[PDB]
Amino acid sequence: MVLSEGEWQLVLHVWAKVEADVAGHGQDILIRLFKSHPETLEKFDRFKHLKTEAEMKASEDLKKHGVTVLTALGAILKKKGHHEAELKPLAQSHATKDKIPIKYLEFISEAIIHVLHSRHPGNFGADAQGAMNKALELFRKDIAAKYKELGYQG
Ligand code: HEM
């Protein structure tokens, strides 16, 4: 009732390429986020001490968090819009535990698209970029609704 079947299949086709190397893609995506929007780094008490790109690449903890982030997102994408159960705990941990504005989810969405385009251009042309953009838009709209339900405006 938001993406068409064909759009979902484009999303899952490129996501399969991510799955070939989750740790690498995860690392790349978090570094791209922090490099482009340094203010996001302040939300992470465990990585705030990291001062250069090399130190980031070498950090076991950052790489582990990358896998955690992408595992969770992939589980959501594979639901093709039917992600209520999976989305609710994610909203709670980003709305009460830690307070992550919708703006910053926008920033990490841009980082994901940047990295997919950098690594898989042959499989991420305009139609695929559009489909992925839509799926990340849907993720953001629905987590924003859950944010509000919990008392956080986002
Ligand atoms: C595609 C978007 C994202 C996904 C799928 C995601 C997912 C997760 C997951 C699975 C965890 C671990 C436990 C939990 O659920 O809290 C986590 C933790 C966290 N996330 Fe996110 N996250 C996303 C975006 C962000 C953004 C944009 C920020 C901050 C700029 C952020 C900040 C954090 C923080 C501060 C923690 C706690 C880590 C710790 O200290 O152990 N997340 N995230």
From Swiss-Prot:
Modified residues (Phosphothreonine): 68
This protein's record includes keyword Oxidoreductase: yes
Binding residues for O2: 65
Molecular function via GO: heme binding; metal ion binding; nitrite reductase activity; oxygen binding; oxygen carrier activity; peroxidase activity
Binding site for heme b: 94
InterPro entries: Globin, Globin-like_sf, Myoglobin
Keywords attached to this entry: Cytoplasm, Heme, Iron, Metal-binding, Muscle protein, Oxidoreductase, Oxygen transport, Phosphoprotein, Transport
PROSITE patterns, sorted: GLOBIN (PS01033)
Entry EC no(s): 1.7.-.-, 1.11.1.-
Entry's Gene Ontology cellular component terms: extracellular exosome; sarcoplasm
Sequence similarity: Belongs to the globin family.
Subunit structure comment from the entry: Monomeric.
Function: Monomeric heme protein which primary function is to store oxygen and facilitate its diffusion within muscle tissues. Reversibly binds oxygen through a pentacoordinated heme iron and enables its timely and efficient release as needed during periods of heightened demand. Depending on the oxidative conditions of tissues and cells, and in addition to its ability to bind oxygen, it also has a nitrite reductase activity whereby it regulates the production of bioactive nitric oxide.
Protein's name in the database: Myoglobin
Taxonomic placement: Eukaryota, Metazoa, Chordata, Craniata, Vertebrata
